[PDB]
Amino acid sequence: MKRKGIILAGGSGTRLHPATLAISKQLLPVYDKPMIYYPLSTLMLAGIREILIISTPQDTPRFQQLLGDGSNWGLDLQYAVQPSPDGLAQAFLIGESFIGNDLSALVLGDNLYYGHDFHELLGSASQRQTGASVFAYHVLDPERYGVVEFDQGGKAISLEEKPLEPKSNYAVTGLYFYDQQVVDIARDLKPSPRGELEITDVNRAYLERGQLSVEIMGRGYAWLDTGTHDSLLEAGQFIATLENRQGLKVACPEEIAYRQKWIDAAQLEKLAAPLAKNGYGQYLKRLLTETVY
Amino acid sequence: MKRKGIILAGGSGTRLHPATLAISKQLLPVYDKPMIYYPLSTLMLAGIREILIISTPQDTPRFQQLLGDGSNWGLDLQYAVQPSPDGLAQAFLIGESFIGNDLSALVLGDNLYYGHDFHELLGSASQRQTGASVFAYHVLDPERYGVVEFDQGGKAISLEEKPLEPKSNYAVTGLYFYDQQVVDIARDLKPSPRGELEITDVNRAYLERGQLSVEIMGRGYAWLDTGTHDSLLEAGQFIATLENRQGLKVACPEEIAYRQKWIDAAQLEKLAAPLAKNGYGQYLKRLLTETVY
Amino acid sequence: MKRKGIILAGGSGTRLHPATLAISKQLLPVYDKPMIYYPLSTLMLAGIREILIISTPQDTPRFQQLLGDGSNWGLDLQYAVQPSPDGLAQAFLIGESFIGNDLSALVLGDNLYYGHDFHELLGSASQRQTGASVFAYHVLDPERYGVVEFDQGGKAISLEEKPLEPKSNYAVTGLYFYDQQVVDIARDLKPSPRGELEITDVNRAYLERGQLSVEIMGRGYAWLDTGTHDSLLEAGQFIATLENRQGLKVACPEEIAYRQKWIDAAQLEKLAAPLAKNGYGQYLKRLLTETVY
Amino acid sequence: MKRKGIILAGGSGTRLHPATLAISKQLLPVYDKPMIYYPLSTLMLAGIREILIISTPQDTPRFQQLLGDGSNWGLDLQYAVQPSPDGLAQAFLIGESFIGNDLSALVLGDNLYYGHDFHELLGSASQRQTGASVFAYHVLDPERYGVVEFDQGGKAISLEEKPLEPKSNYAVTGLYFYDQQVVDIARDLKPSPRGELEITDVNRAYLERGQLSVEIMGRGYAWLDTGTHDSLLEAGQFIATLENRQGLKVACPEEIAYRQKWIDAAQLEKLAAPLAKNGYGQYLKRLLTETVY
Ligand SMILES: Cc1cccc(S(=O)(=O)N(C)c2c(N)n(Cc3ccccc3)c(=O)[nH]c2=O)c1
Ligand SMILES: Cc1cccc(S(=O)(=O)N(C)c2c(N)n(Cc3ccccc3)c(=O)[nH]c2=O)c1
Ligand SMILES: Cc1cccc(S(=O)(=O)N(C)c2c(N)n(Cc3ccccc3)c(=O)[nH]c2=O)c1
Ligand SMILES: Cc1cccc(S(=O)(=O)N(C)c2c(N)n(Cc3ccccc3)c(=O)[nH]c2=O)c1
Ligand SMILES: [Cl-]
Ligand SMILES: [Cl-]
Ligand SMILES: [Cl-]
Ligand SMILES: [Cl-]
């Protein structure tokens, strides 16, 4: 069965004000491209072409101006609004008609991933047609996240949302793969004491039915989020160091679409034209004649 | 005589696309606050309260949403549009009625300044009620700028806009103080070979009449570059290092207004309220009870 | 057959003076640990325990003070001097008696690697008991390196040392695996026009005999070198971002030895003792009770 | 009267191990030059030519190899050892015969200063031929330092070394100017509860006699932190940003000596020769023909 994608690029409330007073966090650049390019590229790398972008009423037209309907990149993008930030699990109610009877994947609009064989890590989660798949990653500050606990055999046995005393240093990352049960689970969720529909409650529902796969995302992968001004800056520096070293870009959607064969050489050449006088368009042009393994 | 301020926050064309596709460069954050806070703070530090913000037609309402009429900060802000990026000198034609018969100051919306006694450096330019004052700063790449040449006595003798063979390494920074002659000079400007109304032509008009003061902005000042992705990132890191070392902010307009006595303690306390859950509001609150020299 | 390691941590001449006037480049820290810890950790990750450190006459005792005989980490370290910087291929002549009749691996003392399944990438090169194995990596500036050219089938067909017009963007990284033929090949090398015994000439000798394996090190790996002051700084920032995100260290030799089972819990506890009041010793202590996948 | 300088470049214990296992912190580079160049340049900027460098027994010959007797730079450098890190005030006992009956200045070997008119700020402290002068700087973490308390009139009224409950956010920086009384005061000091001869006790002695001038080092100056790996890295980035923006170096001793007229053009040209193949020597060469204001 095919899998649809959702990017949640909602309000980060007032947390990063005044930097985010004028625009949405997920429109801020990480080095050389808007933040949302990164999770969008993540969905694309998982082979997902039909994608719903959920944002605030105010910023939706700005996402639309940036991304269009996706057709330029071999995608089909649709848009939905989240009037109020009522929790990550709300994506499934807002996205209910978009999803229909299909499999799905949710990615947070401010999550960046980097590493070798990421494509294959995503592929193996995408091919699991039943149940749910999340990724666990070792962090310094697991108390900020959904935390997964494992028994001595390596099996996930509990999930806790922002525990004061984390059972491990393994956080659940902001990338989630779901079967056709997720909308019904989300519909039956009640708000938590913070007034939010919690994704962790969704994941625990799968866990209790023995249908949650927790794959380790190893330390050789970088999972960056952009939760503070400091971490945003570090994410920019990280991407810049890689791109300036390699002469290759991270999360260039045009490149990914070209490599997935969703667009061809002539379409890529046309996409390069408007940006030909800057490094980004020069990069797209170089992609036409260079072999990159 | 009073001096009015103008902030030119216009289009950077396609140079930083796709990062700047969604929103204007001068609304992007530098570390923890929108870029435009920095030149705005520069004008305020010069004692300027009546300020015209010029931007593109698309982004004007976003500057308006962010900054309002200024009254919350003891300022009087007005707004105007630049339909096409036809040169920095265009600010004086767009801003003609705003300026009237008063003295003026122009700052570029993407210029950041830092250093000791910057207040005094601006004060001494502001008090010159005749002629014009600009600042020259030693840079590695003077070709990118208006370049000033000095004779052996230290007197400015020529200005060249983006010369292929710069006469010195001294660039004219994006901060300009003018008397009542600037509008009339701007009205008589003809477009350059690049189709732009050049500020450098304005400055050369004053130079030929012996009325251009070119002050050296010494190497102990930081005039930070935001022209490239790399330089944007370096500026964010520079500001973060200073703020995290000192526990004091650079270019916090609320603080500057409070210290200029344009707003009082009770007004500052009210401004802190909406942001009380984050570091920026906590900073404003701390300013009410701490003596800072 | 067993494989011995060599780390070349020689003079970088005057290239980074005055920063390197007082000490060797490979003793400078990258974030929180001396540079040489990184390539040392790379050899360890490849399963190599018997390692020759080649440095200048002046700095050998400083490497010795830092690293000792290796016994604290389950290694056996020996030391050799390189009086004059006569080329990377000289490591095999200086290291001839150390190597004996064994397989070998050479790593440059200023090369840093990071990425997922690096262990497995190294393992597959280490298990090739005949011929030579190098890694090719896409860089922005291949003209600074040994460059490998591939035919349409992906087969390596030429190697060029620092070509003005590189045949590809694939540089040979500073990690090299060799069979028992390398010493004899090195002995027959004549100095190049720059007066150096070139590693690229060694690699081309294997290529001509059909015994060079060129494995791609993919873009999901970070290969950093520290060839300039700028790149050194970027390498520090890169490592710090990863370690501060994960609460896990890159190239902690004590950790690697513990995970390879070369030292046990009680030995690791003793190594933690001297450093117990700083973050590094606290990290080693935490490793005793935490499960990390 | 003439004023002699002392640079205290002693042990940082184990705090930054293993990075500092091999070599002293003050020999590590900050961006492009050894750390000690920065405080050395600070003394030079204050017009001080006769300078005692105090370090550990192990690292003294390395400071000597780097700096020599100073004669190449128009300085007269001498050397002395601190066997154990028994407090900053120990500098005056070790340095007693060097100081003699002259005025003095102490700078810590890991303190970096930057800002406009720093020369003048140092000059005005240097010209005070009686009493002592220190500088107070607003910091986020005053507990780490000597902390100065001021009454409502702005007068310094107490000094506390590393108070658990700081009376202000004003730290005393690691630059101190003293009259002929300091040696005798240092001789009468008793160790504190931490077993250290405290500079803060020296400064309090002057305070009680009404002879401590506490000048504010304003927020437009950078007093950069090198106490942690993170802060070391931030300092390197800060210096790189300034130097790469300006094409001018911070704390180039050859430049400062040339500008003070302590060495002439021909001597500077000779100093450039050995480094002519790298940016540092190219910079010195450029200084011979460029006017820099
Ligand atoms: C953030 C992000 C989004 C999408 C992919 C990746 S990645 O797998 O770590 N990575 C560096 C990457 C790639 N590996 N690739 C190559 C690639 C593209 C399509 C399919 C398989 C490989 C790419 O075109 N762009 C990339 O950013 C990172
Ligand atoms: C970019 C910029 C904008 C406004 C001020 C400055 S500044 O003078 O270099 N600077 C660090 C600074 C200050 N010096 N001050 C203190 C100050 C406030 C009002 C008048 C004179 C000084 C402040 O309140 N905010 C500041 O950002 C830099
Ligand atoms: C620079 C470097 C040196 C050695 C390993 C590595 S690495 O494979 O990219 N990496 C992050 C890494 C690890 N993967 N590991 C875990 C590990 C240790 C030993 C065997 C297999 C795995 C580790 O203990 N330290 C590491 O630095 C990087
Ligand atoms: C750390 C430090 C050490 C010495 C000077 C300085 S500085 O005054 O802030 N500074 C940027 C600086 C300078 N201002 N100058 C110019 C200068 C040289 C001699 C006397 C007065 C000024 C210089 O030649 N080198 C410098 O590093 C900072
Ligand atoms: Cl890869
Ligand atoms: Cl200056
Ligand atoms: Cl891994
Ligand atoms: Cl100041």
PDB file of all heavy atoms in Angstrom, chain B residues 13 36-37 173 265 282:
ATOM      1  N   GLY B  13      17.067  40.867  -4.145  1.00  0.00           N
ATOM      2  CA  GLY B  13      16.784  40.093  -5.350  1.00  0.00           C
ATOM      3  C   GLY B  13      16.678  38.600  -5.093  1.00  0.00           C
ATOM      4  O   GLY B  13      15.996  38.162  -4.169  1.00  0.00           O
ATOM      5  N   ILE B  36      16.104  43.468  11.491  1.00  0.00           N
ATOM      6  CA  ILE B  36      15.819  44.898  11.452  1.00  0.00           C
ATOM      7  C   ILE B  36      15.936  45.584  12.825  1.00  0.00           C
ATOM      8  O   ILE B  36      16.116  46.804  12.898  1.00  0.00           O
ATOM      9  CB  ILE B  36      14.461  45.179  10.774  1.00  0.00           C
ATOM     10  CG1 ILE B  36      14.378  46.667  10.358  1.00  0.00           C
ATOM     11  CG2 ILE B  36      13.313  44.789  11.680  1.00  0.00           C
ATOM     12  CD1 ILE B  36      13.383  46.995   9.287  1.00  0.00           C
ATOM     13  N   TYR B  37      15.832  44.802  13.907  1.00  0.00           N
ATOM     14  CA  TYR B  37      16.077  45.318  15.261  1.00  0.00           C
ATOM     15  C   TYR B  37      17.457  45.988  15.393  1.00  0.00           C
ATOM     16  O   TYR B  37      17.598  46.978  16.107  1.00  0.00           O
ATOM     17  CB  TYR B  37      15.971  44.203  16.298  1.00  0.00           C
ATOM     18  CG  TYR B  37      14.583  43.916  16.818  1.00  0.00           C
ATOM     19  CD1 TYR B  37      13.439  44.026  16.010  1.00  0.00           C
ATOM     20  CD2 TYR B  37      14.415  43.483  18.129  1.00  0.00           C
ATOM     21  CE1 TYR B  37      12.178  43.754  16.517  1.00  0.00           C
ATOM     22  CE2 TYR B  37      13.166  43.200  18.637  1.00  0.00           C
ATOM     23  CZ  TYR B  37      12.056  43.326  17.833  1.00  0.00           C
ATOM     24  OH  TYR B  37      10.813  43.034  18.375  1.00  0.00           O
ATOM     25  N   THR B 173      30.391  52.399   5.150  1.00  0.00           N
ATOM     26  CA  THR B 173      29.415  51.524   5.810  1.00  0.00           C
ATOM     27  C   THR B 173      27.995  51.988   5.472  1.00  0.00           C
ATOM     28  O   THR B 173      27.810  53.078   4.923  1.00  0.00           O
ATOM     29  CB  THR B 173      29.622  51.480   7.341  1.00  0.00           C
ATOM     30  OG1 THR B 173      29.077  52.653   7.965  1.00  0.00           O
ATOM     31  CG2 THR B 173      31.124  51.383   7.693  1.00  0.00           C
ATOM     32  N   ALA B 265       9.648  52.785  33.555  1.00  0.00           N
ATOM     33  CA  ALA B 265       9.694  51.459  34.164  1.00  0.00           C
ATOM     34  C   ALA B 265       8.408  50.687  33.998  1.00  0.00           C
ATOM     35  O   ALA B 265       8.424  49.498  33.684  1.00  0.00           O
ATOM     36  CB  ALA B 265      10.025  51.580  35.645  1.00  0.00           C
ATOM     37  N   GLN B 282      12.305  37.706  30.151  1.00  0.00           N
ATOM     38  CA  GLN B 282      13.000  37.610  31.437  1.00  0.00           C
ATOM     39  C   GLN B 282      14.105  38.665  31.491  1.00  0.00           C
ATOM     40  O   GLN B 282      14.347  39.273  32.530  1.00  0.00           O
ATOM     41  CB  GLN B 282      13.557  36.195  31.657  1.00  0.00           C
ATOM     42  CG  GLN B 282      12.473  35.166  32.000  1.00  0.00           C
ATOM     43  CD  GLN B 282      12.817  33.730  31.601  1.00  0.00           C
ATOM     44  OE1 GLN B 282      13.973  33.396  31.312  1.00  0.00           O
ATOM     45  NE2 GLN B 282      11.799  32.873  31.576  1.00  0.00           N
TER      46      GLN B 282
END
